[PDB]
């Protein structure tokens, strides 16, 4: 149908533009600290500790697989980053202190990316 291929314009067009939104969300993590999984080699018990996990890699995975429907999920996935490590990392930390900012400096980049979904349809 026709319906269906201009609903798939759209899930094609609010792809394009949070694939733009990642870029400059993953930007304001110039020390690729949420940039992949964090390691079960490397931290074994993490699961014990956080039930989602969630990176900016895995984020890439679903987006080109257009598996966000709306801002909203993709917003959930943002949040989980800097929720889990706000959790299983202490304040006077390196990586406390990357979430932080990360947060700060995104709430920007998203703030008009939700004013752009609405604008656009």
């Not at 969630?54 to 909203?72: C, I, P, V």
């Not at 989980?80 to 202490?90: T, V």
């Not at 390196?94 to 752009?116: C, K, P, S």
């Amino acid at each position: 149908s026709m319906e269906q291929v201009a609903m798939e314009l759209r899930l094609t067009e609010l792809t394009r533009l949070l694939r733009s939104v990642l870029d400059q969300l993953q930007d304001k993590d110039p020390a690729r600290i949420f940039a992949q999984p964090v390691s079960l080699k490397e931290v074994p018990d993490y699961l014990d500790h956080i039930k989602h996990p969630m990176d900016f890699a895995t984020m890439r995975k679903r987006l080109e697989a257009q598996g966000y429907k709306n801002l909203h999920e993709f917003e959930e996935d943002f949040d989980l980053i800097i929720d889990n490590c706000m959790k299983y990392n202490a304040r006077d930390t390196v990586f406390y202190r990357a979430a932080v900012r990360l947060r700060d400096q995104g709430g920007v980049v998203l703030r008009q990316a939700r004013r752009e979904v609405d604008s656009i349809g």
